[PDB]
Amino acid sequence: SQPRTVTVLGATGSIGHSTLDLIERNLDRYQVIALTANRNVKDLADAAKRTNAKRAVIADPSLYNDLKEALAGSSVEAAAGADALVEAAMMGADWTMAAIIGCAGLKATLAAIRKGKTVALANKESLVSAGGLMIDAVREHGTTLLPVDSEHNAIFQCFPHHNRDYVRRIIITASGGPFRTTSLAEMATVTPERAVQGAKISIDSATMMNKGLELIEAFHLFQIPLEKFEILVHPQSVIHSMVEYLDGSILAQIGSPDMRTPIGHTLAWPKRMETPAESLDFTKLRQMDFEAPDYERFPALTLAMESIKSGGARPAVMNAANEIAVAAFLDKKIGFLDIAKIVEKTLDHYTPATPSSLEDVFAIDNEARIQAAALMESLP
Amino acid sequence: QPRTVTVLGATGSIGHSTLDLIERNLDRYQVIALTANRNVKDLADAAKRTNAKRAVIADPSLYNDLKEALAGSSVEAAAGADALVEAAMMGADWTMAAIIGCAGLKATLAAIRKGKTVALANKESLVSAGGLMIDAVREHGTTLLPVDSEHNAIFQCFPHHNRDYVRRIIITASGGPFRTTSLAEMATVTPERAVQHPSMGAKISIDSATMMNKGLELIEAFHLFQIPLEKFEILVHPQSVIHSMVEYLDGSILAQIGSPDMRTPIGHTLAWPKRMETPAESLDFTKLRQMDFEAPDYERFPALTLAMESIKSGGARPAVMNAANEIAVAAFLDKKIGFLDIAKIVEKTLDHYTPATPSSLEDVFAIDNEARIQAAALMESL
Numbered sequence: 001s002q003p004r005t006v007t008v009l010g011a012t013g014s015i016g017h018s019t020l021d022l023i024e025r026n027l028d029r030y031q032v033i034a035l036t037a038n039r040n041v042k043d044l045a046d047a048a049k050r051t052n053a054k055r056a057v058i059a060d061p062s063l064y065n066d067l068k069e070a071l072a073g074s075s076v077e078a079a080a081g082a083d084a085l086v087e088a089a090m091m092g093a094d095w096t097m098a099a100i101i102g103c104a105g106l107k108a109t110l111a112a113i114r115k116g117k118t119v120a121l122a123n124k125e126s127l128v129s130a131g132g133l134m135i136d137a138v139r140e141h142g143t144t145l146l147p148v149d150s151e152h153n154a155i156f157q158c159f160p161h162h163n164r165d166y167v168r169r170i171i172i173t174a175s176g177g178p179f180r181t182t183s184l185a186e187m188a189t190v191t192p193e194r195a196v197q198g199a200k201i202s203i204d205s206a207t208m209m210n211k212g213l214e215l216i217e218a219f220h221l222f223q224i225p226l227e228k229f230e231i232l233v234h235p236q237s238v239i240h241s242m243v244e245y246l247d248g249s250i251l252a253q254i255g256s257p258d259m260r261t262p263i264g265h266t267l268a269w270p271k272r273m274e275t276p277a278e279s280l281d282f283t284k285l286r287q288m289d290f291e292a293p294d295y296e297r298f299p300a301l302t303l304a305m306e307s308i309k310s311g312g313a314r315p316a317v318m319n320a321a322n323e324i325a326v327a328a329f330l331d332k333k334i335g336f337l338d339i340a341k342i343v344e345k346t347l348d349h350y351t352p353a354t355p356s357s358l359e360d361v362f363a364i365d366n367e368a369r370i371q372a373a374a375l376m377e378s379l380p
Numbered sequence: 381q382p383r384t385v386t387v388l389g390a391t392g393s394i395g396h397s398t399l400d401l402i403e404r405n406l407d408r409y410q411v412i413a414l415t416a417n418r419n420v421k422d423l424a425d426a427a428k429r430t431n432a433k434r435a436v437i438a439d440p441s442l443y444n445d446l447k448e449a450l451a452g453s454s455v456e457a458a459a460g461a462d463a464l465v466e467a468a469m470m471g472a473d474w475t476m477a478a479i480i481g482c483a484g485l486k487a488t489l490a491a492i493r494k495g496k497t498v499a500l501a502n503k504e505s506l507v508s509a510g511g512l513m514i515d516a517v518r519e520h521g522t523t524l525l526p527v528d529s530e531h532n533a534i535f536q537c538f539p540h541h542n543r544d545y546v547r548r549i550i551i552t553a554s555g556g557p558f559r560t561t562s563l564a565e566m567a568t569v570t571p572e573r574a575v576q577h578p579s580m581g582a583k584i585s586i587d588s589a590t591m592m593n594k595g596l597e598l599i600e601a602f603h604l605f606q607i608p609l610e611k612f613e614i615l616v617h618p619q620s621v622i623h624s625m626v627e628y629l630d631g632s633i634l635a636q637i638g639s640p641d642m643r644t645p646i647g648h649t650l651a652w653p654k655r656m657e658t659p660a661e662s663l664d665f666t667k668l669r670q671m672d673f674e675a676p677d678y679e680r681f682p683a684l685t686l687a688m689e690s691i692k693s694g695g696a697r698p699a700v701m702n703a704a705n706e707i708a709v710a711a712f713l714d715k716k717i718g719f720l721d722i723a724k725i726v727e728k729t730l731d732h733y734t735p736a737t738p739s740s741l742e743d744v745f746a747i748d749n750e751a752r753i754q755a756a757a758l759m760e761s762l
Contacts, residue, residue, distance in 0.1 A: 247648055260630075272629050
């Protein structure tokens with residue numbers, strides 16, 4: 001078939017870079033429409049020229065002239081600003097990688113979703129903070145939503161789409177983070193350098209908040225009762241997640257950690273494509289371990305469950321407070337164990353009404369951040 | 381309307397597990413024929429329970445017992461080899477082919493030729509007559525669903541209609557009871573020790589010990605999935621919880637994992653393309669705690685190499701290998717040769733008897749017969 005049209009929102013980050021690596025490696029199969037970046041003008045212009053893209057968009061209006069210059073004498077169109085990001089997402093690409101991080105990516109992601117084509121979703125806030133809204137748009141416009149993160153993609157590959165009732169349970173595997181075998185006592189005094197040893201994501205892995213967030217996203221993605229989800233600690237992180245069917249059969253997605261595997265799955269879907277991802281060598285792996293997550297040592301897991309269980313704006317508030325707490329820890333303003341405490345406090349004192357639009361989500365995120373900062377400061 | 385089902389070999393373990401699922405869904409399934417080999421009692425009871433249209437006992441000598449057991453019911457009674465084939469041709473939309481040995485080839489092929497759905501458990505069908513069986517499937521648009529653990533696991537992770545997406549198929553293997561035993565010690569293994577297991581047939585136990593069972597599984601997999609032999613890998617995994625895997629071109633490896641309950645793979649073939657609930661236990665990974673993996677040892681288990689070479693050569697080799705193994709294993713159990721002589725006799729037979737590729741089941745039977753005689757001759761010469 002003719003070249004497929006593709007657009008990458010957030011083309012210079014880790015996910016974006018891995019995406020472009022695959023697109024470039026198979027440029028003969030793709031027609032790049034738009035690529036966007038936040039402030040990385042150099043890598044953006046390079047990616048655009050490297051794929052003969054129709055348009056390149058830099059998020060910060062301040063960098064517009066720089067982008068134009070980098071694209072001087074090029075057929076590549078240059079644009080900038082938040083509105084331009086949304087316009088790029090509406091250019092018509094059949095396949096869109098939504099990898100702009102944060103609430104800043106919500107507008108463009110929803111816009112792409114509303115186009116009703118294929119959207120490979122990497123942005124976490126879309127489902128954690130605006131899950132109901134995003135999934136509503138997906139269903140309304142017949143969009144093909146393909147999850148990009150490791151666990152979600154693994155689940156998707158083992159999930160009976162169009163027959164959710166076939167699922168008995170979904171198992172989200174977790175490495176357990178750097179403190180899987182660390183006592184609360186020694187955890188209380190870990191330094192940011194030891195915990196991250198992006199930092200934010202690393203810290204979420206340490207507190208296990210990342211799994212709580214993954215749980216929430218999976219709930220929106222697969223639409224099955226919360227009680228059917230299980231978190232299983234698996235140190236090696238080779239089994240990326242699993243799905244058990246009513247007949248007892250458990251389908252699992254296993255492999256090397258190369259992100260080009262899940263990205264490649266979403267890019268080729270419903271087909272399959274070659275990627276340079278290494279083939280997992282089980283003989284060298286030798287062993288796989290499994291154990292129950294310690295809810296006592298990582299209260300973040302419980303907060304996330306209670307949040308999604310209650311629904312409404314709880315998840316959005318939780319996610320927002322965590323952003324504040326994590327940054328505070330990384331800035332040595334609080335202790336490691338204070339992160340989950342600040343998130344919990346925030347959830348307790350701030351319970352806004354459920355969002356009806358992204359504007360409401362933006363409002364909730366901003367307020368929760370203010371609330372969290374206040375509690376973080378008034379911490380005894 | 382109820383889906384019609386026939387179970388060939390309904391009294392063995394597979395048959396019992398198959399009936400378990402059928403009887404929990406009599407509102408969904410209508411039993412046409414049920415067959416057994418010598419267990420008239422079990423056959424008759426099952427037939428009467430499921431209100432089967434016909435029950436066939438393989439052994440002609442037991443025809444009278446069967447008729448008496450069915451007296452008063454509406455279940456038709458039949459017996460003999462031909463009756464099995466006829467039962468398989470009664471028209472069931474779903475047929476469980478579980479008659480073991482070459483004695484199940486005729487009925488299995490007959491069912492396949494009807495072009496509906498056939499859940500395949502009989503091993504000789506693909507080990508000895510793989511080419512013919514797959515040809516029959518292609519000719520009649522038959523839906524062939526593998527029942528055994530590894531094959532069903534592969535099937536659930538396989539890109540049907542897109543074979544080129546496969547990079548490799550990993551057949552997991554427990555490694556058998558002698559997984560960590562040296563060739564030197566294996567040389568001394570006695571029949572009494574080799575058959576020890578946690579009922580299971582002695583032959584099954586020996587094939588597990590020599591890993592011939594794995595070699596045969598590889599042959600079957602080769603015909604079932606139609607991908608290049610070099611794309612197959614055997615991976616020793618003691619726990620046997622991962623039942624097999626398939627790696628795709630993007631690096632993704634899909635695996636089927638679960639408890640050992642055969643109702644899971646059977647349930648999959650019975651409900652296909654849908655899924656049905658079964659009482660199979662949900663694998664508890666926390667209790668499991670650990671999974672181990674290691675490379676197979678082709679030096680210590682030459683049966684694996686023999687299987688590989690037989691497939692590469694194709695033709696009648698697999699059938700010859702299977703028949704020779706039957707003789708060799710029996711000889712070992714009868715204490716006429718040593719444990720390691722089994723694979724040696726098989727190897728010798730494969731080199732000495734090289735008939736033409738089978739063109740019909742009649743040729744397969746002839747090859748099986750001759751291979752058995754040649755193996756026996758070699759077994760005694762040794």
